[PDB]
Design a protein around this ligand. Structure first.
Ligand SMILES: O[C@@H]1[C@@H](O)[C@H](O[C@@H]2CO[C@@H](O[C@@H]3CO[C@@H](O)[C@H](O)[C@H]3O)[C@H](O)[C@H]2O)OC[C@H]1O
Ligand SMILES: O[C@@H]1[C@@H](O)[C@H](O[C@@H]2CO[C@@H](O)[C@H](O)[C@H]2O)OC[C@H]1O
Ligand code: CL
Ligand code: CL
Ligand code: ZN
Ligand code: ZN
Ligand code: ZN
Ligand code: ZN
Ligand code: ZN
Ligand code: ZN
Length: 371
């Protein structure tokens, strides 16, 4: 199948229009690039902000709200008939430090006095409610899907002990969903988003957390599976079990940040796109073929599949693409091979079905067909 321009190619969202929406994460400057705009209009019917809707982007200082960048994404979505996902109301990264400072300016996590810790908990929860209220009151009529909390379960199977949890305990999760439903109403859909949702003990810990929260009447509508995955892991059988188990609790499932890395973990990356062997793209295409056949099998349980980017010229995985060099200066991509030094974050990954020149890859043909 030819490496044709993705602007002359069959629309990816139309191939999946009865199964689930097809989305992309974007930055506002991509809306000023003719190729990226052309790609969003041609192939996607859902959009999400890669970064400008995170807590530190929206309220960098208490009371100073920047909706300008977020507004540009929302206006583009509306003009183009796209669904919008909000990422994300609560997270322990890209979150402003002012949330966690007491009235005298000291970090609340340092407080030992029980009465003062309880006062700090209430102050943090009030600030959390106001952040959520201001955002949902502005976008409740435009944005259907919301990542209310992101990454609240740890990889060890315990709740993540971030400042949110250290200061307020489980109530910050409850307050966040409660607040989004209160100001957004019943028509917005609320999600708990996380990575490695297919991996134990995290998977069981998330399951138990959401089961309990719903038993308590906390309003959660679905689970976002970030799906930052590799060519061989996690297995499709494990992805299927995961999606099925959350659907059995009555939860919608969205694949929210899909990218299929060319590497393992920790990744040993090629230094440029040019150096990635052709065989890697065929291995990736076979993975995409099996993944999307599985998503179609489970389409009644998945409302959206969103890629964490548009095309291979821009992906956050490049920040993880470390390049290892041997004593002679040769690149090393075998995890067990000798190496002398590493250049962190300087290599290139190639995770999508669209190449860096906006031409389709073998993975695109693998998912646009009906085999
Ligand atoms: O310097 C800052 C950068 O580090 C920052 O990079 C962004 C980090 O978040 C990325 O998105 C996350 C990927 O991991 C998932 O688990 C999360 O849910 C996603 O939000 C994003 O792709 C990177 O651009 O960018 C902002 C700089 O200030
Ligand atoms: O900050 C988070 C990263 O730590 C996370 O990376 C994962 C770490 O565990 C590995 O098994 C996974 O391969 C890798 O993706 O990604 C999400 C990000 O928010
Ligand atoms: Cl990025
Ligand atoms: Cl190419
Ligand atoms: Zn379309
Ligand atoms: Zn090139
Ligand atoms: Zn569906
Ligand atoms: Zn980016
Ligand atoms: Zn090319
Ligand atoms: Zn196929």
């Amino acid at each position: 199948k030819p490496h044709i321009s993705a602007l002359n190619a069959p629309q990816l969202d139309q191939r999946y229009k009865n199964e689930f929406t097809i989305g992309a994460a974007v930055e506002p400057y991509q809306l000023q690039n003719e190729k990226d705009v052309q790609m969003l209009k041609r192939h996607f019917n859902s959009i999400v902000a890669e970064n400008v809707m995170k807590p530190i982007s929206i309220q960098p200082e208490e009371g100073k709200f920047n909706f300008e960048q977020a507004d540009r994404i929302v206006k583009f979505a509306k003009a183009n008939g796209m669904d919008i996902r909000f990422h994300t109301l609560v997270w322990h990264s890209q979150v402003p430090q002012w949330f966690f400072l007491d009235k005298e300016g000291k970090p609340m996590v340092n407080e030992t006095d029980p009465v003062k810790r309880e006062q700090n908990k209430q102050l943090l929860l009030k600030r959390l409610e106001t952040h959520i209220k201001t955002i949902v009151e502005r976008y409740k009529d435009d944005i259907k899907y919301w990542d209310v909390v992101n990454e609240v379960v740890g990889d060890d199977g315990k709740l993540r002990n971030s400042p949110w949890y250290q200061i307020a305990g489980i109530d910050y999760i409850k307050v966040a969903f409660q607040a989004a439903r209160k100001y957004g109403g019943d028509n917005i859909k609320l999600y708990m988003n996380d990575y490695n949702t297919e991996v134990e003990p995290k998977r069981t810990a998330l399951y138990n957390l959401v089961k309990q929260l719903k038993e308590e009447g906390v309003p959660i509508d679905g689970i976002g599976h970030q799906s930052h995955i590799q060519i061989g892991w996690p297995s499709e059988a494990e992805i299927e079990k995961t999606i099925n188990m959350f659907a059995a609790l009555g939860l919608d499932n969205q694949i929210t940040e899909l990218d299929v890395s060319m590497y393992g973990w920790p990744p040993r990356a090629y230094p440029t796109y040019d150096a990635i062997p052709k065989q890697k793209f065929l291995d990736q295409a076979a993975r995409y073929d099996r993944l999307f056949k599985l998503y179609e099998k489970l389409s009644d349980k998945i409302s959206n599949v969103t890629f964490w980017g548009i095309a291979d010229n821009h992906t956050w995985l490049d920040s993880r693409a470390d390049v290892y060099y041997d004593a002679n200066g040769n690149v090393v991509v075998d995890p067990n091979a000798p190496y002398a030094k590493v250049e962190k974050g300087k290599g290139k990954d190639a995770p999508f079905v669209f190449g860096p020149d906006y031409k389709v890859k073998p993975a695109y043909w693998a998912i646009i067909d009906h085999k």
